[PDB]
Design a protein around this motif. Structure first.
Motif, mmCIF file in Angstrom:
data_model
loop_
_atom_site.group_PDB
_atom_site.id
_atom_site.type_symbol
_atom_site.label_atom_id
_atom_site.label_comp_id
_atom_site.label_asym_id
_atom_site.label_seq_id
_atom_site.Cartn_x
_atom_site.Cartn_y
_atom_site.Cartn_z
ATOM 1 N N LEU A 55 13.102 -2.867 0.169
ATOM 2 C CA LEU A 55 14.159 -2.376 1.039
ATOM 3 C C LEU A 55 15.493 -2.300 0.311
ATOM 4 O O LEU A 55 16.092 -1.225 0.213
ATOM 5 C CB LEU A 55 14.273 -3.268 2.268
ATOM 6 C CG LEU A 55 13.373 -2.827 3.416
ATOM 7 C CD1 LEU A 55 11.922 -3.154 3.136
ATOM 8 C CD2 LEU A 55 13.823 -3.509 4.674
ATOM 9 N N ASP A 56 15.969 -3.434 -0.204
ATOM 10 C CA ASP A 56 17.299 -3.469 -0.800
ATOM 11 C C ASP A 56 17.389 -2.552 -2.012
ATOM 12 O O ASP A 56 18.148 -1.578 -2.013
ATOM 13 C CB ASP A 56 17.658 -4.901 -1.193
ATOM 14 C CG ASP A 56 18.437 -5.619 -0.115
ATOM 15 O OD1 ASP A 56 19.280 -6.473 -0.456
ATOM 16 O OD2 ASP A 56 18.197 -5.337 1.076
ATOM 17 N N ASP A 57 16.615 -2.847 -3.054
ATOM 18 C CA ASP A 57 16.728 -2.162 -4.333
ATOM 19 C C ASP A 57 15.845 -0.922 -4.416
ATOM 20 O O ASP A 57 15.786 -0.282 -5.470
ATOM 21 C CB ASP A 57 16.385 -3.129 -5.466
ATOM 22 C CG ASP A 57 17.030 -4.486 -5.283
ATOM 23 O OD1 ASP A 57 17.986 -4.589 -4.487
ATOM 24 O OD2 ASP A 57 16.583 -5.452 -5.935
ATOM 25 N N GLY A 58 15.153 -0.577 -3.336
ATOM 26 C CA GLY A 58 14.339 0.620 -3.302
ATOM 27 C C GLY A 58 14.919 1.656 -2.364
ATOM 28 O O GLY A 58 15.847 2.384 -2.721
ATOM 29 N N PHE A 59 14.378 1.718 -1.146
ATOM 30 C CA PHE A 59 14.869 2.650 -0.139
ATOM 31 C C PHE A 59 16.336 2.437 0.197
ATOM 32 O O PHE A 59 16.909 3.247 0.931
ATOM 33 C CB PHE A 59 14.020 2.517 1.117
ATOM 34 C CG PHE A 59 12.573 2.760 0.874
ATOM 35 C CD1 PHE A 59 12.117 4.030 0.587
ATOM 36 C CD2 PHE A 59 11.678 1.713 0.852
ATOM 37 C CE1 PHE A 59 10.784 4.259 0.345
ATOM 38 C CE2 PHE A 59 10.350 1.933 0.596
ATOM 39 C CZ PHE A 59 9.899 3.208 0.350
#
Ligand SMILES: CCCCCCCCCCCCCC(=O)O[C@H](CCCCCCCCCCC)CC(=O)O[C@@H]1[C@@H](NC(=O)C[C@@H](CCCCCCCCCCC)OC(=O)CCCCCCCCCCC)[C@H](OC[C@H]2O[C@H](OP(=O)(O)O)[C@H](NC(=O)C[C@H](O)CCCCCCCCCCC)[C@@H](OC(=O)C[C@H](O)CCCCCCCCCCC)[C@@H]2O)O[C@H](CO[C@]2(C(=O)O)C[C@@H](O[C@]3(C(=O)O)C[C@@H](O)[C@@H](O)[C@@H]([C@H](O)CO)O3)[C@@H](O[C@H]3O[C@H]([C@@H](O)CO)[C@@H](OP(=O)(O)O)[C@H](O[C@H]4O[C@H]([C@@H](O)CO[C@H]5O[C@H]([C@@H](O)CO)[C@@H](O)[C@H](O)[C@@H]5O)[C@@H](OP(=O)(O)O)[C@H](O)[C@@H]4O)[C@@H]3O)[C@@H]([C@H](O)CO)O2)[C@H]1OP(=O)(O)O
Lengths: 563, 563
Positions: free
Chosen positions: B41-45
């Protein structure tokens, strides 16, 4: 089979339909709770800082209360349908069991029938309702989750609609394969368990011949093989699950890969992916539940097959309808041959026997044929294989069962007592009639007033499930009181009781001379006191009348006339 | 008690330790996947980084493969400990189930012992292993999730540790209350089912008397009671789960409310909140399992209590150590009194009976007391309550059990046949001593080589359970064949059946008079052939020596001589 079971459920469609709507609401509650994530991850912790994280605690509380209420409503309503289905089917089984030929209940299937009522009706209902619950709820859950995905991310969704069939078929194949492997080891374990059973009862003849050490060694071998089979079974049953989880994580990996690509991304916000993946993880229970529904339903409809086989079994024939109220006429056995069910040879050999009116004709059946089988004939128990039992001018076949078996009256200490009050037990089917004054007269005539006075209120008391636990002789007198009250034209006795009792043998004798002063009384007995007091004797063994002679002739050929 | 059970499980600590480390790895895999959520979530999407999206599918697959491998390892190794422990406990039960006095195996535990070994050692191993699996795995999962959360968002984790005890105690209280209510209803359900059972068993009467109308109506009432009790049971059982889920959702709502508070509490990035909430949801089943572990463990250590009661029960007394090899001496009875255990204190009245050496003295015990127990006296099956049986200058209480039972040989219709070969069925506890030639001579003298030779390999064939399935006369033949193995001074012939067969009783009696030629023998024969060939007939009824006459005297004491 369900094709034939529907009619007993249809009258209760209301409960099933309320359960269906409640379960669809339950699946919708799951779907809405998961959908609630995107609002959170996007408009709370996401771009919009707040104003959605105080609505949401209460939305979650409301949706879980909806889950709880719809789950309780589904449980209650579907269990009420399960009730008003079992209850009805149990009652139909009971109605059919009581009217079915005595052969069926005579060891054809005796101890399994309480099971086939309770456990098997409950299995029918429970398995069918589990099938309905899983189909409806889990199908609604799958549909709701897939709609939730599609409305949120129509790119990842198609990859899933593709894989979920693959995941489901993989689940089915692996589950079937490894559960089939498991069942073989069940038999291989049962065999070795039977080996230990064999060993255990050899205690005698193991002690005698000192093989205790050899027995310990052989049990060591069988225990080791039992352990190895158990380990193989558990190994298979285990390896089943991780393979499924891995074939599902493969779908997880494919979806994540198909989220990396630039085209799909830039649409999957932080919340959309979370909703899609939560949907995915929640899409594991439904698929497995369906794969198992198609077997739960069949287990249910196999138990229903057993119940229906019992239900449609040939009920005792009632073609004959000739009526009889008082049978003063002689019972006339003339050229009648009968075979005990389960035995090919005729247990009752072709025999002719007349039963003089108002006579205590008796017989002794030490050989085992006709010992109690003759008693069966008059009461139209196991039917006549050959011959005409011309009783009072007509065959027992022609007579109606109800009236016929009304005419006769079997008496013994082994007679069970109904859980209803004792007075009604004496007046069974004569209650609501034969006024309590007649019941008191019968109680007095019984010569067992003392025993029923001994416990509680006498006539009013109840011999329930161990209510007062009348002894053998006391039950015998209850039966004789019943016979006197019902005014049975015929009396059938088997060796009086199994043993004499204090004042109860005398009371039984008083009652049975009060009865036999004027009753066509066919009797059978081994003890010959009542034989001596009897006017006419016909000893019959092996289905043949060994000696058709009175006490004088029977003393001429003693046989077992002396203890 | 697990305290006394540990010695049997300790030697296999390796399996438990590997299972523990494997389960900790399993819970760590679970925890690490939820931790993996945050990167996604944080470092991806969130902050776009395709590197993480392409790094992640490789990690989800790796962690699920690790989870599957460790689950399989836990299932195998903890089943290999449950396997070896349950097998060793079965074997110790069986070893202690043979030296135990025949009394225990006689009507104190007849069919329950089958369960006692298999089912009631499994309900020990499986239950304790389920308790260990839940404790270790789920405690590791709880610790892992809480560490995963504290490392990510300690603010919310404080609230979650505050409430999780609240949720756990709520689960405990509700689950208890409602399962207690369910048991209360179960009692009434069983009681009500018994009523229908006793109705069903009354078939004969409801046929002879009545018209099944009252029976059908009363079953209708009892079925309605069953239905209402079932509905109440399911209603009570269901309401548990919605209430538990509602308390859990109260916890979820409180955590959400904690979030969105100004600045403090809202330091959580989308990834952090998703991980915290995923941990919360995955922390629902560990809490329930930890709460319910103690029921499983206590069920296990209660089945183990039963097994220990069996194991430590008094084994058969073997204090006497007087040895005997061949005993031509007389089995002297003198005023010995012994009560059949559990009933009839005055059984085997004070009885004096000297069986002369090398005779076939017998007795007739039709009275039913002290008839077959006299045989037990010689075999010391049911020990003597009071008296002395002075055998060959020493008492049975002084003789070794093995030797004494070695001296005596018992031939009867109910002789159990070992699952081993026929050669060893006639070499049991004697195989290593005697040779194939000795067993061949035994087969010849058996007068049953007609039946033995027809088998596959003659001596080496198998007479196991089922299989060849020798008849009852052939059972007698094999017993006499063992007697003919020439190791049996005292021959306690049963002969109570006194059956006659087609050439089989012929051969039996041929070989049996071959034995009795030089065998001290005691017999209890209903027939009079033995009395005719008897040496000193001593008829004993009700444990008292009515007579000690010869054949002529017994003819005078005819009794049932004529038949
Ligand atoms: C491609 C096509 C498909 C795609 C699939 C691929 C993807 C799958 C991934 C790989 C698969 C791994 C499976 C797994 O996920 O890994 C699990 C561990 C996870 C580790 C990794 C997995 C993900 C990692 C992330 C990777 C990505 C980087 C455990 C497992 O592995 O356990 C598997 C298990 N799944 C779960 O636990 C996930 C569970 C939880 C676990 C995951 C949670 C989060 C993880 C990731 C989040 C989502 C991703 C983003 O939740 C769910 O399912 C859905 C959860 C998603 C919803 C969102 C929540 C979070 C959102 C917020 C954050 C985002 C599943 O059964 C468990 C079911 O139990 C409860 O039922 P009940 O209803 O209670 O009765 C749950 N209800 C639970 O209500 C309660 C709720 O959840 C929570 C509500 C409470 C709120 C607060 C919680 C606590 C608060 C206070 C505490 C502090 C059900 O939840 C459901 O479905 C219901 C419904 O959906 C719920 C949705 C709504 C939930 C809340 C929404 C909130 C919204 C947020 C707010 C906006 C749940 O499904 O099936 C397998 C077989 O287990 C069984 C079997 O079912 O027979 C069970 C046992 O048998 C029996 C028994 O005898 O006791 C007999 C049965 O007859 C039956 O009675 C059964 C009963 O059900 C038990 O009660 O028990 C046992 O025996 C076993 C045995 O092994 C057999 O061999 O068999 C198990 O495996 P196995 O045991 O190993 O063999």
């Amino acid at each position: 089979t369900f094709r034939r079971l529907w009619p007993t459920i249809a009258p209760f469609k209301a409960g099933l339909i309320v359960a269906g709507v409640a379960l669809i609401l339950n699946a919708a509650s799951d779907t809405f709770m998961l959908s609630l994530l995107k609002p959170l991850l996007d408009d709370g912790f996401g771009k919009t800082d707040r104003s959605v994280l105080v609505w949401m605690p209460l939305v979650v509380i409301g949706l879980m209360i909806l889950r709880g209420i719809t789950s309780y409503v589904s449980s209650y309503c579907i269990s009420w349908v399960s009730g008003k289905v079992v209850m009805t089917m149990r009652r139909r089984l009971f109605g059919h069991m009581m009217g079915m030929p005595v052969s069926f209940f005579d060891k054809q299937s005796t101890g399994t029938l309480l099971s086939r009522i309770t456990y098997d009706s409950e299995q029918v209902a429970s398995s069918s309702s589990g099938a309905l619950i899983t189909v409806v709820r889990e199908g609604a859950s799958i549909i709701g989750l897939f709609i939730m995905m599609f409305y949120y991310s129509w790119q990842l969704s198609i990859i899933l609609i593709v894989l979920a069939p693959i995941v489901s078929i993989a689940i089915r194949v692996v589950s079937k394969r490894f559960r089939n492997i498991s069942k073989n080891m069940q038999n291989t374990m049962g065999q070795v368990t039977t080996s230990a059973e064999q060993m255990l009862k050899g205690h005698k003849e193991v002690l005698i011949f000192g093989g205790q050490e050899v027995e310990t060694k052989r049990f060591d071998k069988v225990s080791n093989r039992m352990r190895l089979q158990g380990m193989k079974m558990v190994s298979a049953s285990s390896i089943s699950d991780p393979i499924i989880q891995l074939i599902a994580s493969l779908a997880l990996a494919f979806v994540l890969y198909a989220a990396s690509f630039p085209s799909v991304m830039d649409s999957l916000t932080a919340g959309t992916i979370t909703v899609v993946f939560s949907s995915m993880i929640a899409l594991m229970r439904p698929l497995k539940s369906l794969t198992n529904v198609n077997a739960q339903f069949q287990r249910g409809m196999a138990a229903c097959q057993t119940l229906f086989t019992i239900l449609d079994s040939e009920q005792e024939k009632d073609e004959g309808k000739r009526v009889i109220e008082r049978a003063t006429g002689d019972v006339e056995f003339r050229n009648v041959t009968f075979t005990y069910p389960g035995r090919d040879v005729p247990a009752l050999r072709n025999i002719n026997l007349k039963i003089p009116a108002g006579k205590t004709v008796a017989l002794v059946g030490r050989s085992g044929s006709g010992k109690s089988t003759i008693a069966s004939l008059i009461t139209r128990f196991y039917d006549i294989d050959e011959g005409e039992i011309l009783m009072d001018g007509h065959d027992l076949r022609e007579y109606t069962l109800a009236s016929l078996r009304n005419q006769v009256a079997l008496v013994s200490q082994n007679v069970h007592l109904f859980n209803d009050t004792v007075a009604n037990n004496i007046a069974y089917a004569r209650t609501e009639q034969y006024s309590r004054e007649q019941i008191e007269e019968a109680a007095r005539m019984a010569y067992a007033m003392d025993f029923i006075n001994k416990m509680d209120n006498g006539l009013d008391t109840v011999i329930g499930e161990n209510g007062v636990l009348l002894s053998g002789g006391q039950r015998q007198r209850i039966a004789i009181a019943r016979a006197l009250l019902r005014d049975s034209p015929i009396l059938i006795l088997d060796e009086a009781t199994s043993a004499l009792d204090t004042e109860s043998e005398r009371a039984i004798q008083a009652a049975l001379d009060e009865l036999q002063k004027n009753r066509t009384s066919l009797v059978i007995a081994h003890r010959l006191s009542t034989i001596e007091k009897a006017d006419e004797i016909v000893v019959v063994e092996d289905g043949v009348i060994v000696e058709r002679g009175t006490h004088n002739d029977l003393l001429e050929h003693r046989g077992v006339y002396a203890q």
